[PDB]
Amino acid sequence: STPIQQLLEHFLRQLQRKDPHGFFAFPVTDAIAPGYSMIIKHPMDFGTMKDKIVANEYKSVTEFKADFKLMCDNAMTYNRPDTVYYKLAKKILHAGFKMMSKERLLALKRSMS
């Protein structure tokens, strides 16, 4: 593993801790969510993100964070506010923004001096 891959694997593991049953860890099928593939044009999940890390397909934390945002937006757009899935997306969203805040990222860039 590389240093960038170590860092992104760590952020990913912290996000997955918020979803202990893995509802965000695999692609959502139309069989479990009617009409999903017509409503959500750009699917994303934590399994897909892990694969991208392993392929060194992320060049920056910004690129990783974009996928995290996408996964949350899809869940908040497809699902109604009363559902488990909408509430869990919001929980993951707040955690990710605290962990990868522009301030934390700046401090870490300084730790490399």
Residue 75 binds ligand OF5 (CB under 6 A): yes
Nearest to residue 26, comparing CAs of 13, 11, 16, 39? 16
- b/e per residue, 95-112, with b = 16+ CB within 10 A? bbeeebeeeeeeeeeeee
Interface residue with ligand OF5 among 1, 10, 17, 26 (CB under 6 A) is 26
Residue 33 binds ligand OF5 (CB under 6 A): yes
Residue 68: CB minimum distance to ligand OF5, A: 13
**Contact residues for ligand OF5 (CB under 6 A)?**
23-24, 26, 28, 32-33, 75, 78-79, 85
